[PDB]
Structures are given as structure tokens and as C-alpha cells.
Amino acid sequence: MNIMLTLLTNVTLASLLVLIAFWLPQLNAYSEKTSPYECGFDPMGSARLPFSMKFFLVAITFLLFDLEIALLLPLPWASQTNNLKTMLTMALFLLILLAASLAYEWTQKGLEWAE
Amino acid sequence: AKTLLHKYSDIPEGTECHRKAYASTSIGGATGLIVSAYSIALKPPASFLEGVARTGRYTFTSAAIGAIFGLTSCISAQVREKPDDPLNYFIGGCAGGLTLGARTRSYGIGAAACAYMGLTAALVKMGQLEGWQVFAEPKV
Amino acid sequence: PGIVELPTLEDLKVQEVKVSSSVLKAAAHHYGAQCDKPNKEFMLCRWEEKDPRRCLEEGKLVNQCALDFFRQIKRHCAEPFTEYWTCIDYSGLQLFRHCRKQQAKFDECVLDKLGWVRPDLGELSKVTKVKTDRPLPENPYHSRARPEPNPEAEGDLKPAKHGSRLFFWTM
Amino acid sequence: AGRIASFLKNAWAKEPVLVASFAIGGLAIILPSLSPYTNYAIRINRATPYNYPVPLRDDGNMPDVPSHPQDPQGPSLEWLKNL
Amino acid sequence: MTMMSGRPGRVPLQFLPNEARSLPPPKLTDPRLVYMGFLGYCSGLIDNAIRRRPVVSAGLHRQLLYVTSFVFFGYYLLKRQDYMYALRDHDMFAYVKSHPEDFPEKDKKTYGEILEEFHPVR
Amino acid sequence: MNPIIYTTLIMTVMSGTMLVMISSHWLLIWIGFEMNLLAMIPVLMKNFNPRATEAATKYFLTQATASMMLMMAIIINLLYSGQWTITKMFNPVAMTMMTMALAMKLGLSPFHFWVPEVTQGISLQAGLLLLTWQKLAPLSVLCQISQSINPNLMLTMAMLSILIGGWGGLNQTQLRKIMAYSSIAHMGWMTAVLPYNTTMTILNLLIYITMTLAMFMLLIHSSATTTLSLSHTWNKMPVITSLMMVTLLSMGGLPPLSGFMPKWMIIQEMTKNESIIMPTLMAMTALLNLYFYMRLAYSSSLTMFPSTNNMKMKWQFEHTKQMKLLPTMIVLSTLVLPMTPALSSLN
Amino acid sequence: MTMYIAFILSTIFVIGFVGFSSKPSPIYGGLGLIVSGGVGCGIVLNFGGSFLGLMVFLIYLGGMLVVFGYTTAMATEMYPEVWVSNKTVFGAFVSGLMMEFCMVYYALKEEEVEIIFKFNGLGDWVIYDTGDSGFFSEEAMGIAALYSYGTWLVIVTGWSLLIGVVVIMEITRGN
Amino acid sequence: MPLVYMNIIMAFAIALAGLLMYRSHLMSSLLCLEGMMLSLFIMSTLIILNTHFTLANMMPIILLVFAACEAALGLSLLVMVSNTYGTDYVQNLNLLQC
Amino acid sequence: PFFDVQKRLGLDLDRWMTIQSAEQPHKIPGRCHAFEKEWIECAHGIGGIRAEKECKIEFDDFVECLLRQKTMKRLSAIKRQRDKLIKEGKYTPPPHHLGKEDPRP
Numbered sequence A: 001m002n003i004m005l006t007l008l009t010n011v012t013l014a015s016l017l018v019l020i021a022f023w024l025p026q027l028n029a030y031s032e033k034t035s036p037y038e039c040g041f042d043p044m045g046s047a048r049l050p051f052s053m054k055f056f057l058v059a060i061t062f063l064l065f066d067l068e069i070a071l072l073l074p075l076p077w078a079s080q081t082n083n084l085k086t087m088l089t090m091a092l093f094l095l096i097l098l099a100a101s102l103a104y105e106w107t108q109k110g111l112e113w114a115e
Numbered sequence B: 001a002k003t004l005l006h007k008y009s010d011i012p013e014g015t016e017c018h019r020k021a022y023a024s025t026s027i028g029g030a031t032g033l034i035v036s037a038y039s040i041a042l043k044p045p046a047s048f049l050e051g052v053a054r055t056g057r058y059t060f061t062s063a064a065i066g067a068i069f070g071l072t073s074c075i076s077a078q079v080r081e082k083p084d085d086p087l088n089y090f091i092g093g094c095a096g097g098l099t100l101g102a103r104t105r106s107y108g109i110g111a112a113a114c115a116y117m118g119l120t121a122a123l124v125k126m127g128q129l130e131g132w133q134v135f136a137e138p139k140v
Numbered sequence C: 001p002g003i004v005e006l007p008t009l010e011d012l013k014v015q016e017v018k019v020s021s022s023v024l025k026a027a028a029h030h031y032g033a034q035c036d037k038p039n040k041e042f043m044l045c046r047w048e049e050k051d052p053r054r055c056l057e058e059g060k061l062v063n064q065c066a067l068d069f070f071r072q073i074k075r076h077c078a079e080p081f082t083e084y085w086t087c088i089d090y091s092g093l094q095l096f097r098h099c100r101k102q103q104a105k106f107d108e109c110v111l112d113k114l115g116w117v118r119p120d121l122g123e124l125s126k127v128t129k130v131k132t133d134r135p136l137p138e139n140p141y142h143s144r145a146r147p148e149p150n151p152e153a154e155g156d157l158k159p160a161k162h163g164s165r166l167f168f169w170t171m
Numbered sequence D: 001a002g003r004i005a006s007f008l009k010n011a012w013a014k015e016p017v018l019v020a021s022f023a024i025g026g027l028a029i030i031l032p033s034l035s036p037y038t039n040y041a042i043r044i045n046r047a048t049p050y051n052y053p054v055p056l057r058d059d060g061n062m063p064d065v066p067s068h069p070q071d072p073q074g075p076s077l078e079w080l081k082n083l
Numbered sequence E: 001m002t003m004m005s006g007r008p009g010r011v012p013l014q015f016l017p018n019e020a021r022s023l024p025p026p027k028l029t030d031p032r033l034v035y036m037g038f039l040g041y042c043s044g045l046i047d048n049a050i051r052r053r054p055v056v057s058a059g060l061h062r063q064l065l066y067v068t069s070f071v072f073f074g075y076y077l078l079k080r081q082d083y084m085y086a087l088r089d090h091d092m093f094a095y096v097k098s099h100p101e102d103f104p105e106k107d108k109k110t111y112g113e114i115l116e117e118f119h120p121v122r
Numbered sequence F: 001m002n003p004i005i006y007t008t009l010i011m012t013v014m015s016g017t018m019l020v021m022i023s024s025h026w027l028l029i030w031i032g033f034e035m036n037l038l039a040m041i042p043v044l045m046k047n048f049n050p051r052a053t054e055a056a057t058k059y060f061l062t063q064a065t066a067s068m069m070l071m072m073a074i075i076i077n078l079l080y081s082g083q084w085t086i087t088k089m090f091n092p093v094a095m096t097m098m099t100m101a102l103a104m105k106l107g108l109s110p111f112h113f114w115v116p117e118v119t120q121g122i123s124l125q126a127g128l129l130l131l132t133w134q135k136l137a138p139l140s141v142l143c144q145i146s147q148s149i150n151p152n153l154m155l156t157m158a159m160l161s162i163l164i165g166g167w168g169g170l171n172q173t174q175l176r177k178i179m180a181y182s183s184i185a186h187m188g189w190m191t192a193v194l195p196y197n198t199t200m201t202i203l204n205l206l207i208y209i210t211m212t213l214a215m216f217m218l219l220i221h222s223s224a225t226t227t228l229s230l231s232h233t234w235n236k237m238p239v240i241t242s243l244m245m246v247t248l249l250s251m252g253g254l255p256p257l258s259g260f261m262p263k264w265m266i267i268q269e270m271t272k273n274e275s276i277i278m279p280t281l282m283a284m285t286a287l288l289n290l291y292f293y294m295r296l297a298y299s300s301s302l303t304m305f306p307s308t309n310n311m312k313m314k315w316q317f318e319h320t321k322q323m324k325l326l327p328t329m330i331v332l333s334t335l336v337l338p339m340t341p342a343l344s345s346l347n
Numbered sequence G: 001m002t003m004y005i006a007f008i009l010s011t012i013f014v015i016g017f018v019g020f021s022s023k024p025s026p027i028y029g030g031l032g033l034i035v036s037g038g039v040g041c042g043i044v045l046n047f048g049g050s051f052l053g054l055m056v057f058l059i060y061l062g063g064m065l066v067v068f069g070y071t072t073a074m075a076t077e078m079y080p081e082v083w084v085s086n087k088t089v090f091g092a093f094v095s096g097l098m099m100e101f102c103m104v105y106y107a108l109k110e111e112e113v114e115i116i117f118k119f120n121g122l123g124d125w126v127i128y129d130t131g132d133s134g135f136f137s138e139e140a141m142g143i144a145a146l147y148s149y150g151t152w153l154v155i156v157t158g159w160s161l162l163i164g165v166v167v168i169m170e171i172t173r174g175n
Numbered sequence H: 001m002p003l004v005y006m007n008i009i010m011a012f013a014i015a016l017a018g019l020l021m022y023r024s025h026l027m028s029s030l031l032c033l034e035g036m037m038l039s040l041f042i043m044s045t046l047i048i049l050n051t052h053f054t055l056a057n058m059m060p061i062i063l064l065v066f067a068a069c070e071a072a073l074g075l076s077l078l079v080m081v082s083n084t085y086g087t088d089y090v091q092n093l094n095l096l097q098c
Numbered sequence I: 001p002f003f004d005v006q007k008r009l010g011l012d013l014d015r016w017m018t019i020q021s022a023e024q025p026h027k028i029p030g031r032c033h034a035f036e037k038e039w040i041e042c043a044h045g046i047g048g049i050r051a052e053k054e055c056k057i058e059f060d061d062f063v064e065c066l067l068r069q070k071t072m073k074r075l076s077a078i079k080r081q082r083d084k085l086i087k088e089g090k091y092t093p094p095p096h097h098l099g100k101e102d103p104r105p
């Protein structure tokens, strides 16, 4: 209930700053002024055209390595168990396969960006 | 639902022909709506109103078939004083087949539907009389 | 399905222990040393009966033992104890460690006036034995009768008469 | 013996990060099985009383169960204070 | 839909319980074993024909191994099948015995006292 | 694809199926399906081309939808009983959702659309795998929860599968689509008997897998994927076309061939449960499968189609690779009817 | 009854689902799914699931960042669609909104079996348990048990993650 | 049942419907698949917390793991489709028929 | 279909997680532990067909603990009657139900 009040206060302050920024100063908007910036000149194509991603394979791999973090975050609590040999074996096993998947993609040129 | 089939079959055979005709028309309309849904899904009708027209065509044909069948069979049963007789269902099914043929405007479709629909309806009546099971329970 | 029986509000009355959690925490070790017997009786009752309605008298004995303990403390040295639990109470986590001088004074006080020895590390968490006159409850789950099993397999295995008997096969 | 020597030499010269990583990983894997304190950690975890110790009904045949916490029977945490 | 999977005291993956040994094993000239050997022989011949080798002559060690493998597996298949039929009959008889009120013995009539309907053929 | 990677992926597919088959917990069964699909997508694209990409994409979409539905059914079942064990479903709605999810995984009608397209889009080896090994897991799950399932929905989907398999197979000239429609009809047969006797389901599955393995291996041996390309095999390998002719008749279900045994066993079991009508429909409809098998046998073995001049060069070369189990598969696909009472060992 | 906070949160959850299911531009679909993930974090937090809520929020933030990159890379069109730039997207959005409205009305003013079963409402607080014990979080204990009880689960998930890396490398190879 | 449970099941139904009815982009369907997973996570978590099944607190994490694998798998296929056609449209993949 | 490798080898690959009454960490119990214990012990070894009829009482109690449908119905009935009798002024709520109780420890 305190965190909800905090979030509400912060969003309200930011929104009021935007409101002031838009309603206090004088506004003189014309087409030349509101046009897209490309350093002196008119853009050739649209900025909504497909923009190639050369690290597309590291982006997919990030999705799988980010879930390794969800499996490793309970580790401070897992350390409190009685069968520490099973916990340590399992935790070590998990990080070893994470290192092996990194070694696989590295040696197969999966970390190099497309050319 | 099969609650529609019960609202059809809860009415006795040669009694209240208007109610039985209404029930059979409802069954036919449901069937035609399902048919038109699958038809629109698998072969798009190129515009909204043409899909509406195809739906109306299919549903009206199916409901007309159901109406004619139920009306004819109930009336034939009550006039002949012969309930529990597959001939009434045969007459109704053949009338429904003639309805479908007049709808598609095809003499061959008319005759073929007369025959096959009548035989199917007579078989359904025989199964109701004898206790035949389509989806039998696992008895053993 | 049957009416639930509840004690009347009269049988639920007791002389309450109306001291706060800091006082309880400051006294906890000696309180567990001194009032062990009725507390253990009550917990054994509670965990064998699985019904709070069956252990009210043990709970009232628990209350009276706590009140006698605190009356002894009040009668022999309230001031060292008050110092100690005020120190404990200042802390937002109520940590024993930030109050060792006050705890030492309170401990010397009870050791000299009453002969109370603070339990050592690991003793209050022992599983102990309790001698009781309360009969061991027979069906604390109020179980029904279990259904009878299926009879069993028995006898010698003889080859099936006339083999498999599939349509035309003779074996 | 001399193949792996020059191999680790070239690795330390070209990829010291991977060398240190494999050393630290291998140590983390093998050292816990040679330690006399791993059992101490298991025992420390077992000595932490998270839930209430439910007492046992005395039947006159329990010579090794205490009847009061300060009685001498039961487990001892003395080894822990001196640790 | 699963009649014998849940039977009591059944080991998960035996293929041949110990109780099966109270049953007579199939003879080695059992016609079903001979048919399994014939299946192995046909497999050997088709093997020769596919690899464009002489059909009846090419690999005699190979054909012998085909026949032997088929006979070997078929022996144990027959043992398990006969054992399962013995289980079925055992259970059926025990169930009939323990539920006599479901399988009553009614007095049977001679045909002299049963009135049968006559239908002339004409 | 590196051979070691291909072996690892085949082993992961098989281990996912085995996880589905050995598990007692619904979550582990779901994990088995997930692992199977994960390893199976690359096997479809092993030979890269746009058609293989499209086939793998349609496959992934269908199977992942089925997976979500399966998980939702498990969660509803847990909500109405704190149970994770796979026995009999507690909630009727959860059972409907589960049945539809497994039908989508199997490709039963009306969820049959994916099977012909994906089968046509991949190679003959991947098609072999897709149509034999990919059926074990959902069928085993269905066998476990058989008492719980509603007969009306199951039998509806099974009869639809038989009808649609026959009708769709009638129109094909590509051999992979013929095999796919054959598979759809066979699945209909397997699932029609499931609420009555799971042993008949297992027997049907074993015989179907044997015949399908034989057919796919014969199609690989004579590297043909169309009807006209298979019409040449007589002028290079006549034994292959004769064996294919007999295997085709066994698939049709004609006696005294093995293919007739599953149909015969299923009809008999159904009659015991007072169900005369469903079986009469099923057999009369399998007549369609027999028709297009007979058409393929006409074009491939019983008559001789014209050939090409370059076939003379092929006359001079033996097959580089030989299939070890092809001979055994043909014999088990054709000559096993006298061994029918051995089905008791399956229960 | 009390403040019906979780009811408002679950309604906003459904609204975000309608937002991204209407199938508009992916930039706005990912926005809708982020909003849904955040309010689902809140829903779970209100029941005692702090770790699980925060975890699903973190995971979906990472996933939607990857999806934004892929949308600019392969999902772009000269005029990306919003919920009001298209009759089809707007119609799906409105139909989902008032379908949720009809479900909620029919459920809270009388007691109907929609599809599975029925419900009267009362607010979520009624089904709580009033349990009084512990120096720990039971959620944290059950999740930590993955390393002592759930050895088999750890094995199968680690294998699947390694195989997933190998698989994406195989799929995106080309040739 | 509780109002909250009804809302989560509705979210699953809406996402399932979204997946089923395709538009032009594949990425939108992939998003719908993710949405279904999100609703399954929430539903299972609510059921598990409510009944205090302690050991089942780990299954939503496993659910997320597999969901990530599925998401990764989906994006790979999209990369290959886009490389073939220069567009992630569903209509392009019509080479194979029934 | 189901090859019980666990039972043959005595492994416990996933049986530790199938039910709510089975060995939780720190002995934390399930909310419906006793009801489930009872339903499991009532139906053990008698097979699925007999268990559904002969253990329906235990299972109905278990489901009531799980979903609490009858409890919410009874509470709703009581509160509706309270609302109705209060609107007409026939019934007056006690002080300890309006916020003026004498709280006890």
C-alpha cells in the first residue's frame, strides 16, 4: 500500500512536469520546424523500413541465458538445506552446462556478428 | 446441443406436428450454421456481405429441409394412425431430399437426396425402435 | 452434516499475559527453562489431539505458569529486567546482541535471587519427553472404516483350457 | 608433460582470462570434496531449529530423551561455540 | 479399456513372471515355432533378393542367423502368450467361484419337455 | 549438420518420448513433449530449402498450440483436485481440452490439415520419423487416461479421421501426401478402439509402424517421391516394385495379409460392446484407402510405364547404401496373420 | 469486498491481453504484454508470491526487449498499425473489451456457470488461510527445494537449455 | 470460484483466440503464444500459493524455462522465413497444400 | 504406454511431487493435508472403479477444503439475511462486530 502510493506519486510528478513543459512556454509550430532531423536535408526513405540486426543470434541466445538466471536466483536459500552435497552437485552441474553452451556457440562462430 | 434432439424427441410421434416441425427446423438451422462457418473459414468469401449471403443460403436450405422433414413425417404418422413405423420417416426424408433438389435446382440431386435421405431416416427410426447405439458405451 | 460444538465464552476466559513482545523476548530463555513442564504438556496435547477444543485446561495452566514466572521476576528485581527489555525494545529487530550488559545484570540478578541458570546454546530446541495421564487419542482423524480389499490371487497356475480360443486357433 | 607445458604457456600468453576462468572453476569443483569443514556446514544447517520441537510421550522406555532441556541427554551444540 | 495392466502383484517390466514356470513350456517342434523359423527364412531370401545376390544360395551363415533369431525370439513370445492366457482363465474361474449368485446353475430340461416352435418349409 | 549433432538431436527426440512414457507426473509429461518438439524442429530442416522451412514453421505452430492447451488442461485438473498424477481426469472440461490437445498432436481430423503439408515439405527420412516415432507419446498418454475420456468426442474424431484420410488420399500424385493421408486414416482406426481396449490400440500401432517403415524404406531405396518417378523403378529394380505391391495390399487390409489383422481385431472388440454400426462404417470407408493403394500398385508394379534412355547408365550401378532392417520389415508387414493370438502378450 | 484491488489488477491483466491479442503492430503488442506482465506481478504479489511475481516480470522484460529488436529488424511496415488505425484491429479490441465486460457483469450481479463452473464474487480475501508460524517464506523454501528434491527437474531443464542453444544454431545456419 | 481465477482463464482464452486468428505478421502470433504462457504461469502460481503446496512452487519456474525455449524456437523460424521472403507474412508460406 | 521404470528400480524420479501430503521441506503442511491423507488412505489398493463410489465422502470433503464452495454459499446466505434484517431495522449488529471489541492477546 505504501509502494502503490510511492509509484503514484512518482508518475504524477513526472506527468506534471510534462504538462508544465507543454503548457507554460509559447508555441510556434510550423511544418519546417516539426519535420524529421537528418542533419540538413530531407531523408531519402522512411525510418520505418526494415533495419537489419547483425547480432540476431546473440539475441536469441540471450533469451536462453536469461532463464538460467531464474534457476540460479534461489541459490542463497538452497544453501540452507541439509543435503549440501546434492545441492552443490546440482548447482555446479547447472553452471557447467551454461559454460558448455557458451563454449559451443563461441567455437561455432555464433558470437560473431553477421557481415 | 443434444438438448435440441431431446426437444425434438420429447414430443410424441404423431402428435403436435407444428411443435415437432419447429424442433426439426431448429436442428436443421444449427447444422446449416455449422456448415457455413466451416465453409467460410476454409474458403474465404471475398467480402463480408458475400459471406453473409453464403451463410444465409446454407442455413435457409438446411432449416427448410428440417422443416419439411419434420412436418411430413409427423403428419404422415398421425394420418396413417401408424406410429412406430419407419415408413413415416422414409416419407419425410424423401420430401426433405426433394426440398434440397428444388433448392439447388437439380433433378438428379433431388432424386438422389430423396432416396438416400429417406433410407437414412428410416434407418434412424429402426434404430430408435430397436435400441441401436451409434456411440456405444464401453460395456466390456 | 452435523453441528459444530464450541466452548462457551465463559470457558474461554483466563488471566491474560499482557506484556509486550520485547518483555517476552527478554524473558524467553529463563521462561523456557522454568515453565517447561506445562508448556510441553500443552504442546503434546495440542499435537496429539489436533483439536484446539480438547486442550483448553492445558492452555490455562500455561497462562498461570507464565504469570507465576513473571510475578517472581517482578517480586525480586523489576529494575534490571526493565533496563534489559527497554534496551531490547529499542531495536527494530529486537536483537539480543546489542544488549549484553543489561542481559548480564538481569542474569546475575536471577541467578543470585532465585538460582536461575540461563540455558546454553542448543538446549531449548531439544526434543524432550513428557509424562502425562491424558490417554492417547485413538482416532484423532475421526476416520471412517476402510473399505475391504479385493480378495487375493491364490492357487496353482494351470494352462488355459483349449489354449487361446481365438476364432479358429487350436493353441 | 612438455606438450601441455608449452600449451599452457601459449594460453597464458594469448587468453589469460580463459586460463583464470578454468582454474577457478576447477578449484570450485574439486576442493569441496577434500575439505574437513563441509561436514561442519551440514551439521550447522541441521542444528538450526526452524520449527517447534514436538515433545514425545514418555512411556518409561526412553533412556536417551531428556525430560527437561537442561538435562544432559540429547544433542549438544558445544562443538559449535568453539567453532 | 485396460483390463490386465492393474492386476495386483505385477512387476513392471518382467516379460516373464516366476509363476509362469509352473506351466508346460512349448515344445521345440511347436508349429508356431516352425512358422517363426519360416518367417526368418523368408527374411533371409528377401535379403538376398534385394542386394541382387543369388536368392537360395548366397549367404548361408546369414540365412542361418535369420532363422535362428526368429526361432529364438518366438520361443519366448510363445511362453509369454501361453502364460497370459493361463492368467485369464485362472482369474475368470476364481471370479465365477467367488460370485456364485451371478452364475447360477439352473435345472436343464430334456427336449421332450421343452416346447419348440415348428416352422414348415414350403 | 554435423553427424554428431544429428545423433544428439535424434537421441533428444527419443528421450523426450521416453520421458512422456515413464513419467507419473503431469509436469514431466509436458516436459517430455516440449523436449521432443525442441529437438524435432531441426530434424525437419536438415536439408535446407524454403519448403522445409515452411513445413517446420507449420509444425512448430501446431504443436506449440497443442502444448499450451495441454498445459491448461493440466492446470484446470489441478485446480479441481490437488493432483499431479496421470490417472483419470477429475474435471470434464479439463478432459475435453486434454483430448483436443492430444488429437492436435496426433493430427486427427478436424486437426488433420498439418500432416500432409509437413510430410510433403520434408525429406523421406524425416517423413519416416514424423509418421512413425512421433505417434508414440500422445498415444501412450491417451492410453493412460482412457477411462476418463468421453466416447462421443473420441469416436467422432476417429470416424472423421478415417473418412478424411480416404477422401484426401484419393486426390494425390505425390507419394508423401499419400503416406500422410494413409497415416491419418490409420490414426482414426487406432483411436476408435481406444475407449474399449487399449491393447487393440497398441496392436494396431505396432502393425501400422511396421508397414509404414517398410513403405518408407522402399521409397528411399528407389529414390522416388512422385507417382511417375516410381513408375520407372520396374526398369531398374523389379523386385523392389513387387515387394512394394505386396506391402501395398497389406496396407489395404486384404486377407490373408498382416494388415488385415488390426482391422479384424478392432471390429470384433467393438461388437462385444454392442457397437455394430460404427465398424460397418469404418470398414466400408477404408475401401477408399484400398482404392488409392491399388492405383499406386497399378502404376508401379502391375503394369509397365514408359522409361527413359538414361536409365541404361543406372543399370550399371549397385546401391551404395543398404538398409539392414528392410527385409525383416517386409516379412512382418505381410506374413504375420497366423501369429495373431500373440496379441495377448501385449496386455 | 475489501478494496477489490486484485479484481482491478486482473481486469487490467485481461485488458492488456485484449491489447496484444487484437494483433496490431508488434511494438504495441509487446507494450501490451509488458503491461500484462507487470500487473500479473502485482496480482501474484498480493497473494504472497514475491519471488515468482518479480521473476516473471524480469523474464518478460528481457523477452520483450529481444522482440522489439526483432520487430524493427523484420516486422516493420511503412505505417505500423495501432488499435484505432484499422477497422479489424479496432473491432477485435472492442469486442474483447465488451466481452470481458459481459462476463464480469453476468458473474458479479448473479451467479452463472459460464463454461467450467460458477462464482458469486465476494473478493479474494475469503479463501485465505490465517496461518501463524515461521521465520521463513514458504514460497522461498519450495523454490529452494529445487536443488535438493528436484534433481530430476534440474537435469531435464539443463539438458533442454543446452539443446536449445544447439538447436537455434542449427536452424539459423542456412545453406 | 473467485473473480480473480475467472479473469485469468479469460486471459488464456483471449490469447488462444488471438493465436488462432492470424493477421499478416507472424511476430504477432508469437506474441500470442507468449501471452498464453504468461496466463498459465499466473494461474498455476495462484493455485499453488492458495493451497500451500510447497514443493510445487518450483513448477512455474520450469514453465518459464520451457516457455523461453519455445520463444527462442519461434524467433529462429521467423529469421529463416524473413530471410527467404524479406517479410514475416503468413501468406507467403503457401507452397505446400493438402 | 506407461513403463513403470521408477517402480521397477525403486527410484522416485517424480513421485515426491505428485501429492500435497508427501514430505514437504521443513514439514510445512498443505492447507488440505488431513483431507487428502484421508481420501488417499480410504481408496488405497481397491482400484479406480471402487474408489470413486466407496471413497466419495472423503473426496467430497477434500474438494470442499480445496475450493470451499459450500462455505462461501453458507456465508453468503448469512450475510444476505443480515443485510435484509438490518435494512428494515429488525436486527442490530453487536459492538464486537462494529469495531468496538475488547481485544485479547
Ligand SMILES: CCCCCCCCCCCCCCCCCC(=O)OC[C@H](COP(=O)([O-])OCC(O)COP(=O)([O-])OC[C@@H](COC(=O)CCCCCCCCCCCCCCCCC)OC(=O)CCCCCCCCCCCCCCCCC)OC(=O)CCCCCCCCCCCCCCCCC
Residues within 6 Å of the ligand: B033, B034, B036, B037, B038, B040, B041, B044, B045, B046, B047, B048, B049, B050, B051, B052, B055, G018, G021, G022, G023, G088, G091, G092, G093, G095, G096, G099, H013, H014, H016, H017, H018, H021, H022, H023, H024
Ligand atoms: C478455453 C477455450 C476457449 C477459446 C475460445 C474463446 C475466445 C474468446 C476471445 C474472443 C474475444 C476477441 C479476442 C481478439 C481475437 C483476435 C481477432 C483477430 O485478430 O482477427 C483477425 C482476422 C483477420 O485479420 P485481417 O487479415 O487483418 O483482416 C482481413 C479481413 O478481416 C478479411 O478480409 P476479406 O474482407 O477479404 O474477407 C471477407 C470477410 C468475410 O467475413 C464473413 O464472411 C463473416 C460474415 C458472416 C456473418 C454471420 C451471420 C450472422 C448471423 C449469425 C448469428 C448466429 C445466431 C443466429 C441464429 C439464427 C438467426 C435468425 O472476412 C473473412 O472471410 C474472414 C472470416 C472471419 C469471420 C469471423 C471468424 C469466426 C468463425 C467463422 C464463422 C463465420 C460465420 C458463420 C456463423 C457461425 C455462428 C455465428 O479478423 C477477422 O477475420 C474478423 C475481425 C475479428 C473481430 C471479431 C473476433 C471475435 C470472435 C472470437 C471468437 C468468438 C467467441 C467464440 C465462442 C464464444 C462462446 C464461449
Ligand SMILES: CCCCCCCCCCCCCCCCCC(=O)OC[C@H](COP(=O)([O-])OCC(O)COP(=O)([O-])OC[C@@H](COC(=O)CCCCCCCCCCCCCCCCC)OC(=O)CCCCCCCCCCCCCCCCC)OC(=O)CCCCCCCCCCCCCCCCC
Residues within 6 Å of the ligand: B105, B106, B107, B108, B111, B115
Ligand atoms: C435390378 C434390376 C433392374 C433395376 C435397375 C434399373 C432400374 C433402376 C433405375 C432406372 C431408372 C430410375 C432412375 C430414376 C430417374 C432419375 C431422374 C434423373 O436422373 O434426374 C437427372 C436428370 C438430369 O436433369 P437436369 O440436368 O437436372 O435438367 C435437365 C432435364 O433433362 C430437363 O427436364 P424437363 O424440363 O424436360 O422435365 C423435367 C420434369 C418433367 O418431366 C418431363 O418433361 C416429362 C414428364 C416425365 C414424368 C412422367 C410422369 C407421367 C408418367 C408416370 C406414370 C406413373 C409412374 C409409374 C406407376 C405405375 C402405376 C401402375 O420432371 C419432373 O419434374 C417430374 C415431376 C414428378 C413426376 C415423376 C416423379 C414420380 C416418381 C414415381 C413414384 C412411383 C412410386 C412407386 C409406385 C408403386 C407401384 C409400382 O433429370 C432428368 O432429366 C429426368 C427427368 C424425369 C425424371 C422423372 C422420371 C422418373 C420415373 C420413375 C422414377 C422412380 C424409380 C426409382 C424408384 C426408387 C424411388 C425411391
Ligand SMILES: CCCCCCCCCCCCCCCCC[C@@H](O)O[C@H](CO[C@H](O)CCCCCCCCCCCCCCC)COP(=O)(O)OCC[N+](C)(C)C
Residues within 6 Å of the ligand: E005, E011, E012, E013, E014, E015, E077, F203, F206, F207, F210, F258, F332, F333, F336, F339, F340, F341, F342, F343, F345, F346, F347, I001, I002, I003, I004
Ligand atoms: C507386425 C508384427 C509386430 C512386430 C513388433 C516388434 C517385435 C520386435 C520387438 C523386440 C522384442 C522385445 C520387446 C520386449 C523385450 C523385454 C521387455 C518386456 O519387459 O516388456 C514387457 C511387455 O512385453 C512386451 O509388451 C511384449 C512384446 C511382444 C510384441 C509382439 C506381439 C505382436 C502381436 C501379434 C503379431 C505376431 C508377431 C510375430 C513376431 C515377429 C513389459 O511389460 P509391462 O511394462 O507391464 O507393459 C507395458 C505396456 N502396458 C503397461 C501398457 C501394458
Ligand SMILES: CCCCCCCC/C=C\CCCCCCCC(=O)O[C@H](COC(=O)CCCCCCC/C=C/CCCCCCCC)COP(=O)(O)OCCN
Residues within 6 Å of the ligand: A096, A099, A100, A102, A103, A106, A107, D011, D014, D015, D018, D019, D021, D022, D023, D024, D025, D026, D029
Ligand atoms: C573444469 C572447469 C570447468 C568450470 C570452469 C569454467 C566456467 C566458465 C569458463 C568457460 C567458459 C567457456 C569457454 C569457451 C572457450 C572458447 C575457446 C575459443 O575458441 O576461443 C579462442 C581463444 O582461446 C583459445 O585459445 C582456445 C582454447 C585454448 C585454451 C583456453 C583455456 C583452456 C584451459 C587452460 C587452463 C587449464 C586449467 C587451469 C590450470 C592453471 C594452471 C595451474 C579463440 O579466441 P577468439 O575470441 O575467437 O579470437 C578472435 C580474434 N582472433
